[PDB]
Swiss-Prot record, chain B:
Function according to Swiss-Prot or TrEMBL: Adapter protein, which is found in various multiprotein chromatin complexes with histone acetyltransferase activity (HAT), which gives a specific tag for epigenetic transcription activation. Component of the NuA4 histone acetyltransferase complex which is responsible for acetylation of nucleosomal histones H4 and H2A. Plays a central role in MYC transcription activation, and also participates in cell transformation by MYC. Required for p53/TP53-, E2F1- and E2F4-mediated transcription activation.
Free-text note regarding domains: The PI3K/PI4K domain is required for the recruitment of HAT complexes, and the MYC-dependent transactivation. Although it is strongly related to the PI3/PI4-kinase family, it lacks the typical motifs that constitute the catalytic site of PI3/PI4-kinase proteins, and lacks such activity.
Name the UniProt record assigns to this protein: Transformation/transcription domain-associated protein
Variant or mutagenesis effect after changing residue 96 to F: Found in a cutaneous malignant melanoma sample; somatic mutation; induces cell transformation and confers resistance to apoptosis
Organism annotation: Homo sapiens
Length: 389, 105
């Protein structure tokens, strides 16, 4: 497995598979940890051009190994002692690196813990309890400030934080009252606030202006921090600054993590309404509505369904008129705008059934203008809108 | 003679206006791609419909649009990966045939 030519690693992994399947389990338990170390290194090593499917082979074999070993047994006590010893070793090993910089092994480690817990009558935290020590002194970031570590290490740390704090018993729950917990929280909050390039000039990030995965990890870190009460204002402000981001990849990540966040401050957004105001004033006009605007609208309404009322639907239909005209004029982008505009109505409740006739009028006008019946972009959102009622 | 009955069948679609040309095959390209899977020779239809509709060149646009979508499958389904590779090479040759007006697409 430690040869650098992937076809040697594959030979190692296939040998592992045969050995695991063939021999009696009493013997397998003894070498479980060696098998696991080799298999994990196989996937850790390959992160350039990986292989002709070595990593997939490795993951499948690893899960097979864990399922075979952890399965409960006659229950001869010596076998049980060996089983629990090996299980403790494996759990220690896996817990050790749920924060590792190498993502391909980090996610595999997390999923491995999931499967291991599910296989047995125990929860993930229940199997993590005797190994909290291995994770005590860094999952709250100790010593140097977060900006001094390399970026990928930061992503590893914050992903480990989110995973650990997402578990219902919440191992290593953070608290602003404690030292260096407020530091971590404020540092990542400022990271989120660094939407502008003014702070991307810093040496630790200037080397790779991508910046997006790090901000996604920061958003997840904020979102998992809903349980403690006093963060409402800043957390929500940052998250809604993100939801308004022009970066579609960042916008959708904000949408996704708001799902987890809204298990706390559900309607503080609606009560405040200033998180959505930065949308309203430009949301009128005639031509202001680009693809990003409509996408943000359908997002911020897919959650907070009550966010809008009938008169807003009328305004939206008025807007739709313009683009419906414009697409047909140009073909004699616009249709990408119009399709999203139509789809929006399907999502929002409180949309009167009366708008069926007006919007259908313009739809038919423009489709006749284009003389298109098949493959038109408007049928599918129309079907979705009507099928509900 | 099959290599020409297919040519005529493909040609029957060329004369109509491009505005309908784009739609007619935008709506049904995946089915013909699937059908080609068990016809090593039927891809002559696509070859002719890429060469003569060089006067149209929209077929290539929609073909690349669809192949971009199905790209991840290539390299896993070897049998279908081969077809995807053939089609990609054909569309790439298209721009060689038409250095003009294919650079735009």
């Amino acid at each position: 497995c430690y040869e650098q030519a992937w076809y040697a690693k594959l030979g190692g992994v296939v040998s592992i598979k045969f050995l695991m399947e063939r021999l009696p389990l009493t013997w397998v338990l003894q070498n479980q940890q060696t098998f696991l170390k080799a298999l994990l290194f196989v996937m850790m090593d390959l992160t350039g051009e990986v292989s002709n499917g070595a990593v997939a082979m490795a993951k499948t074999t690893l899960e097979q190994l864990l399922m075979r070993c952890a399965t409960p047994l006659e229950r001869a006590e010596e076998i049980v002692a060996a089983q629990e010893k090996s299980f403790h070793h494996v759990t220690h090993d896996l817990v050790r690196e749920v924060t590792s910089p190498n993502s391909t092994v980090r996610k595999q480690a997390m999923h491995s813990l999931q499967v291991l817990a599910q296989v047995t009558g125990k929860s993930v935290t229940v199997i993590m309890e005797p190994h909290k020590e291995v994770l005590q002194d860094m999952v709250p970031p100790k010593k140097h400030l977060l900006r001094h570590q390399p970026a990928n290490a930061q992503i590893g740390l914050m992903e480990g934080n989110t995973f650990c704090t997402t578990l219902q018993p919440r191992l290593f729950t953070m608290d602003l009252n404690v030292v260096e917990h407020k530091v971590f929280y404020t540092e990542l909050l400022n990271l989120c606030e660094a939407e502008d390039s003014a702070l991307t000039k810093l040496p630790c990030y200037k080397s790779l202006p991508s910046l997006v995965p790090l901000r996604i990890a920061a958003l997840n870190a904020l979102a998992a921090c809903n349980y403690l009460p006093q963060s409402r204002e800043k957390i929500i402000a940052a998250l809604f600054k993100a939801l308004n981001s022009t970066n579609s990849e960042l916008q959708e990540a904000g949408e996704a993590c708001m799902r987890k966040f809204l298990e706390g401050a559900t309607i503080e957004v609606d009560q405040i309404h200033t998180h959505m105001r930065p949308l309203l004033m430009m949301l009128g006009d005639y031509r202001s509505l680009t693809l990003n605007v409509v996408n943000r609208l359908t997002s911020v309404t897919r959650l907070f369904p009550n966010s809008f009322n009938d008169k807003f639907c009328d305004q939206m239909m008025q807007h739709l008129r313009k683009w419906m005209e414009v697409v047909v004029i140009t073909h004699k982008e616009e249709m990408k705008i119009c399709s999203a505009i139509i789809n929006l109505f399907h999502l929002i409740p409180a949309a009167p059934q009366t708008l069926v006739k007006p919007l259908l009028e313009v739809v038919m006008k423009t489709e006749r203008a284009m003389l298109i019946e098949a493959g038109s972009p408007f049928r599918e959102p129309l079907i979705k809108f009507l099928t509900r009622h | 003679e099959e290599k020409e009955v297919l040519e005529h069948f493909a040609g029957v679609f060329t004369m109509m206006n491009p505005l309908t040309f784009k739609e007619i095959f935008q709506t049904t390209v995946p089915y013909m791609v699937e059908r080609i899977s068990k016809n090593y020779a039927l891809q002559i239809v696509a070859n002719s419909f890429l060469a003569n509709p060089t006067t149209s060149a929209l077929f290539a646009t929609i073909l690349v649009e669809y192949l971009l979508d199905r790209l991840p499958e290539m390299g896993s389904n070897v049998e279908l990966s081969n077809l995807y590779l053939k089609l990609f090479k054909l569309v790439f040759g298209s721009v060689s045939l038409f250095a003009a007006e294919n650079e735009q697409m």
